[PDB]
Design a protein around this ligand. Structure first.
Ligand SMILES: Nc1nc2c(ncn2[C@@H]2O[C@H](COP(=O)(O)OP(=O)(O)NP(=O)(O)O)[C@@H](O)[C@H]2O)c(=O)[nH]1
Ligand SMILES: Nc1nc2c(ncn2[C@@H]2O[C@H](COP(=O)(O)OP(=O)(O)NP(=O)(O)O)[C@@H](O)[C@H]2O)c(=O)[nH]1
Ligand SMILES: Nc1nc2c(ncn2[C@@H]2O[C@H](COP(=O)(O)OP(=O)(O)NP(=O)(O)O)[C@@H](O)[C@H]2O)c(=O)[nH]1
Ligand SMILES: Nc1nc2c(ncn2[C@@H]2O[C@H](COP(=O)(O)OP(=O)(O)O)[C@@H](O)[C@H]2O)c(=O)[nH]1
Ligand SMILES: Nc1nc2c(ncn2[C@@H]2O[C@H](COP(=O)(O)OP(=O)(O)O)[C@@H](O)[C@H]2O)c(=O)[nH]1
Ligand SMILES: [Mg+2]
Ligand SMILES: [Mg+2]
Ligand SMILES: [Mg+2]
Lengths: 290, 336, 284, 285, 290, 290
């Protein structure tokens, strides 16, 4: 794998990706936060192959957290074989065992929607260990369900953790400030106003005028939302995903195509973002159309 | 029987709590104003999202969920009927902070004297929160929430909910409620006013340093080092800047609202704070008396016992922004 | 495509959106035939009236990921990992890729959709369908064994707009699902043609639409408390007339007290007089 | 059965008209209204053949769950076996006889979480989704060989009561799947007055009491918020003690007022004994 | 091993470390409460070498509380064997038995993030026995899952317990005042002002001007943090761990390096910290960058 | 066991110990209700030896309640073998059996931290017999797990039950119903203003004036807490056990020793108590230092 292979279709600036990989080699843990629809899940698998430099899926594990996730499933816990219960090495514990076999090659763990599950409960012992200065046998810790003090679990140096956390919902956020320190937080923007996004549209038999019209439209819409940080922070601002996908058939992006998506997707969304103002909904919806 | 226009009171409470358009509402009375805040405040939260706190649950279920508690499992023999005692983390909006909002909404609904539109929206919201459990509110509940895990926004509505709960009295019917006549009583109005200024000063007077200062008598007693019998003395506010120190004592009296004899009993407290307070910096020592009046504001200055003291008033009921100018204008004069 | 009371354009919108996006939510009041639409609609898309492909479930507040996808539940011998319906269903479509298998989710609004779907909240998206996008599930013993949504599966979600819940709003899930409103369809002739081909009076049908629409507009007047989503559905009229009892003012009176009157209470809570007016208006 | 029931005949016919078509129904009324006695005779009235076997009765409570109701695992002598519940056993019983109507009585339905108890089946009991087409495999049915479907013949009657002010707004689950019918106490009705004239009651004693309770029922229901229409007292207390063999008398009422109505009045108000004293006194005379 | 060896690199004053040993040796159980990034974990492993006076790992045991610890895990619980359950002596019970093997040499048990778990449940019987007075055979007590034949468990005198409670997450705070009497609370400050932090920066090819600038800017921020108590109390104030790390390669400290720190870690931290007005965020980020 | 050994060292008045001994012989179910640091656990071991009149371990048994404590361990229950389930006599069952043999000699059972566990779950059926009037063979009952109804368990009249409850937590406002009926509460004052507390300090090389100054401050401080009811009740107030400890070496009392104690015990305790008013913390801390 190579760096340039990824960047062809990527809307995010390279400056950010170099910033991402710079931290990730340093901190060994990062969290990518942006609105829904900006390629967090998309980049993250790409980023792993850049960081490792080789397209090996065996070394990468990708999981999505949710409410029904606990330390027993993640790391260790007692679970039923059948008639008899057993201690079940969880997925992360197994992944770290794999990393120990091959110290040289970097192993990457990608956690989508990390902000959902109770991280303090899920990681637990790992909450300390995962930090860049605390990896290695010197900081070995016995786990909850370990038979004795001698059985101890230490994160390998090689492991890199990547977290994907949407900021659209304030309810589920990483408020645990101690844990916030372990993860180095890299915001991600929709990146409408970039060359790479336009080349994607322009290559798809698209009007050059319409593209600049569209980018000018959304950039203002995003900034309006970002202004009212009390009501809606910048994290809520609309992503580029609605506009990206749907053209694989070969449909050229005419003004009609934009008008179709807005009614189905953005229109109810704006009603949700602006519950109290019905007029304000009309203004921004009509602005795109006209 | 003159009092402050009710809308202006809400602003003093806001500073009192340390943290909107009221032109729309036509109900002048306080509960109409306050309910519109809460009723709209909850709606602002729901847009971003209400607090969801993982509540652990240890319960008897037909399977493995999270962590099984082996002891409760074998002791109750739950395995035999295909059940385990297992601990898991349900995610609810039923938190203590959230329950309080809902119970207060019932109180707002039950109030006999309230705008009809306001009650209509509130009754909708009470319906819109099915999962949350109604509660019988006491101050003890709010006491537990002083930890402040909740956001800066939640703490505002909870303060509103705290205010309503305390100022709720039964009215015509056993079920319904009637609002307290908050404005009439001096003690709560004064305690608002004293706290209103202290919190007001920290925000606006970025130039000066603002602290409430405990003071100790210059006395010595042959009997006791303690001096418990002597009155406890704590400044209302002290607003110290390098050029001048200043103590203010402010109180709400009904008698002063009358434009005759004048109520200045608070001044007796003030001098003794000036005397017992001794400045290391020795720049200067000044005092200010500020009271609320309705019609107009008059400022006087005095040189009493070697101290520079102000008697002043502010015309609450004028307009809230101009009032902000008037309050800062006063402090500028005397502080300098 | 014949007895449907919904416009042909909207179903034309739906089929294109469904085929392209692969997920949709049909959101409207109760009584607009969301379920009948979805059941009819699935059969159009499959091209055959196959009930085995189509599976319907009705979410409810206690529904959880243990039931839906994976879970530990007891057999006769003891405990085991029991593959829930969606894992079981996605396996079924995985066996036969070419045909289109459909999943209908009723009362979707009630449950905490993130909790139930969980891992598939990412996978369900049309681009993220395939082996490359697989993830190991929560209860999977080994990382190597993973779960991936197949490309053929299409999901249809039925949402009742009459229970707004100010509990959790997720704008990410809204991205996966393309939301389609459904209006009751009183104005549409197709609903009228059904009744006019059931020996209804020409005027009576015209009066009925006038009566209900005046009610519907009142409900949508105050968007904050109530809305277009709350407004009354038509379905109550469909049922109960295939016995042979032709429409009459007496028949409507039965339905109003039987069916519409509770609805009115819930919407116009603690306001009997407003109910009396709109209830009585219908009888006239 | 028609003559014995005290509720208006129009209501009795109305229920069958709703029940036959809708197939799911719930009766909400005050305690002492004969909700259970109504449903049984109404169940027999709907079948027309007075078979108790067809009817099966269940009382809900907060502990009641799917393991009892439908299917569950109970310990054997050693190990454990799947244990079929009431509704699963009941419906399979009706499955043989499609023509024959089978009824199920769910008492105090509002107490339990309908979802938790029924589970999967909660959609299947909605009349639109009934029969072989709407088969769903159940939670504990490990194999897919057999599926559970509630057949068309089954009708579900639920007994709910508006006694308690503690009750909040009814669960959303019920409202969708159930049609709510309110039962009046029925003092005014001729059928109740003809039940006391047959027992040699004085018409003045009869007529006064109908007027006397009605005066209470109006005031208790006059309250907007705490005590509504649902609270108002039922007639069941008046039945018990008359046709066993003991004739009506004024003192017989006095026993009955103290027995049930007097404490009941205290529970609803629970504030002022004087208000209780006046109304209880007026009942006596 | 001795104090001079340990305190070469520690940024904490000598004053506290002696204060720590004053309370610890008399009281035998302490808690180090400070914000994240102040070396609470760092010192605690080092303290173990001081009190024993020697670097042996066996006399030390380190664990972390993950809000899933229970009495079954810590002291006594039932664990599955192949077909049937057995009683397993927990980690602390295993440790105390080692501790009484030799009373002369002191034994340390270190519990990170003690604040999280419901401590009343975990310790249980030990909550009485941990205290300095209530140690030794005189206060022998029978445990819950003890054998029918009387066997009693007493915390030996030699054992010392050290806890590491961060003060950022307010909810996770010890409000069991019966329990808070067993432990002694030693606040640990951020450590900016001290020269011993500064000397660490200077030695790594750093200008003293920037170093003195850095501490000046940070201390201004922490006062703004410390002044509030409603949401951001004294405890939230920013730790020094961010600046410590990442300079091992030879990266000299400069505003270019500081710029990476502030944009990436601190600036997210601040916006979550305040989350009322963006202007306050823009102020403090620019102050550090300026 | 002569009273002379017992009662001098104790700070609690000889008046109140008499009252305690009255109710205990009369009612046999007694609860000492006081804040942490007032010697609840300290007296109870002594009181048992007072009543028996001798120092014998056999006649006295001590346990601490916690949430895991249950009937199946306390009284009777089934414990797994490698496979089988064997019934096992619990503590109270085994202890009373000892008491049956010697009816004349008084027997004591000491139950610390009783509020933590629900009594009903633990005692269960035995709360019926445990009451003072319902003792002796006439009221015998067959237990829940008894193989046959013939086997019966009655709490003999000789045993007296002592329960140590601390009113230091907000939850205890809803006191358990089970405790009040069957146990008789006794309140323990903190007891700064006591002659014996002073005499303990005076013998340990303490100035008389310094000691009395301290009592005036603490009595003033505790009085401040007693005024509140919403946040801090009377039971929250400071105990007298911080000051007793730490003088065993011979280190003389002084403001220096007090200064460590305030900084490491009472200052953070006040931070927890008075979160809402930070200055209120400062008001006392300097006052206590004074
Ligand atoms: N082809 C292409 N698609 C992109 C690009 N950037 C983002 N997308 C698309 O947008 C969709 C979502 O990516 P994703 O990371 O999951 O967005 P998200 O913010 O993580 N969503 P969520 O937060 O809800 O998980 C995919 O279709 C993804 O491929 C891009 O540069 N090229
Ligand atoms: N070299 C060196 N590193 C220090 C010093 N003080 C703190 N650190 C470093 O800062 C980082 C974190 O310290 P740590 O003890 O974990 O802080 P913490 O409070 O335990 N962290 P948390 O609250 O998140 O659990 C480590 O790299 C630690 O070694 C020091 O004096 N010298
Ligand atoms: N010498 C002496 N020590 C006392 C006296 N009163 C209390 N103490 C000491 O205070 C320390 C703790 O007493 P303790 O009874 O455990 O307090 P507690 O109420 O049990 N604590 P908690 O409520 O948290 O369980 C012991 O050293 C105890 O002896 C006393 O009068 N004299
Ligand atoms: N012919 C026809 N029948 C309909 C239509 N809409 C609903 N029905 C019938 O109305 C009955 C109830 O539909 P239901 O799914 O419960 O309503 P919904 O879920 O709220 O949409 C079923 O018989 C539906 O098929 C329609 O548009 N046309
Ligand atoms: N004989 C007879 N008894 C009736 C009639 N109506 C109600 N009852 C009696 O009242 C009792 C049932 O009352 P009910 O309200 O259901 O009791 P509840 O369920 O506890 O509220 C039984 O004795 C019924 O037979 C009736 O019309 N005739
Ligand atoms: Mg994603
Ligand atoms: Mg740590
Ligand atoms: Mg104790």
């Amino acid at each position: 794998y190579c760096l340039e292979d990824a960047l062809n279709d990527l809307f995010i600036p390279e400056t950010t990706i170099e910033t991402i990989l710079k931290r990730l080699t340093i901190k060994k843990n990062i969290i990518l936060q942006g609105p829904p629809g900006v390629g967090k899940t998309f980049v993250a698998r790409r980023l792993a192959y850049l960081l490792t430099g080789e397209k090996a899926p065996q070394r990468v594990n990708m999981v999505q957290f949710h409410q029904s996730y606990s330390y027993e499933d993640f790391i260790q816990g007692y679970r039923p074989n059948g008639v008899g219960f057993r201690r079940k090495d969880g997925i992360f514990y197994n992944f770290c065992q794999q990393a120990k076999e091959q110290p040289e090659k970097k192993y990457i763990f990608i956690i989508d929607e990390i902000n959902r599950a109770n991280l303090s409960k899920v990681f637990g012992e790992v909450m300390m260990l995962m930090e860049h200065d605390k990896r290695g046998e010197n900081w070995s810790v016995p786990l909850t369900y370990s038979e004795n003090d001698e059985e101890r679990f230490y994160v390998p140096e090689n492991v890199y953790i990547i977290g994907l956390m949407n900021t659209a919902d304030r309810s589920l956020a990483v408020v645990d400030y101690a844990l916030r320190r372990r993860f180095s937080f890299i915001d991600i923007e929709p990146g409408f106003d970039t060359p790479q996004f336009r080349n994607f549209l322009l290559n798809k038999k698209a009007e050059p005028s319409f593209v600049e019209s569209l980018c000018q439209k959304m950039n203002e819409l995003n900034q309006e939302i970002s202004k009212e940080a009390t009501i809606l922070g910048k994290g809520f601002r609309i992503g580029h995903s609605y506009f990206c996908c749907g053209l694989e058939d070969g449909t050229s992006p005419d003004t009609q195509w934009l008008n179709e998506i807005v009614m189905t997707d953005i229109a109810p969304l704006l009603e949700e973002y602006f519950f109290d103002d019905p007029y304000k909904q009309q203004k921004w919806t009509n602005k795109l159309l006209g | 029987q003159p009092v402050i226009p009710v809308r202006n009171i809400y602003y003093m409470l806001t500073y009192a709590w340390g943290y909107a358009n009221l032109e729309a509402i036509p109900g002048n009375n306080l509960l109409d104003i306050l309910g519109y805040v809460l009723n709209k405040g909850v709606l602002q939260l729901s847009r971003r999202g209400l607090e969801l706190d993982y509540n652990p649950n240890t319960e008897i279920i037909p399977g493995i969920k999270g962590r099984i508690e082996f002891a409760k499992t074998i002791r109750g023999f739950h395995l035999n009927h295909g059940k385990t005692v297992s601990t898991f983390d349900m995610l609810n909006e039923d938190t203590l902070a959230n329950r309080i909002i809902k119970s207060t909404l019932a109180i707002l609904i039950k109030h006999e004297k309230l705008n009809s539109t306001i009650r209509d929206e509130a009754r909708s919201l009470y319906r819109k929160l099915p999962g949350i459990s109604t509660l019988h509110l006491t101050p003890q509940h709010f006491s537990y929430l002083n930890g402040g895990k909740n956001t800066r926004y939640y703490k505002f509505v909870i303060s509103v909910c705290k205010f309503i709960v305390n100022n709720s009295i039964p009215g015509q019917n056993k079920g319904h409620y009637r609002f307290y006549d908050f404005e009439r009583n001096e003690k709560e109005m004064s305690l608002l006013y004293q706290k209103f200024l202290y919190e007001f000063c920290r925000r606006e007077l970025t130039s000066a340093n603002t602290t409430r200062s405990y003071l100790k008598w210059d006395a010595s007693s042959i009997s006791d080092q303690s001096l418990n019998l002597l009155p406890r003395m704590e400044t209302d506010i002290t607003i110290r800047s390098s050029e001048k120190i200043l103590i203010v004592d402010a109180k709400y009296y009904k008698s002063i609202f009358s434009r005759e004899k004048f109520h200045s009993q608070n001044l007796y407290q003030l001098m003794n704070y000036l005397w017992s307070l001794k400045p290391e910096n020795g720049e200067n020592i000044g005092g200010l008396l500020i009271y609320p009046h309705v019609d107009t504001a008059v400022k006087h200055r005095y040189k009493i016992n070697g101290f520079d003291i102000g008697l002043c008033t502010v015309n609450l009921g004028q307009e809230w922004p101009c009032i902000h100018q008037e309050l800062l204008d006063i402090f500028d004069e005397y502080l300098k």
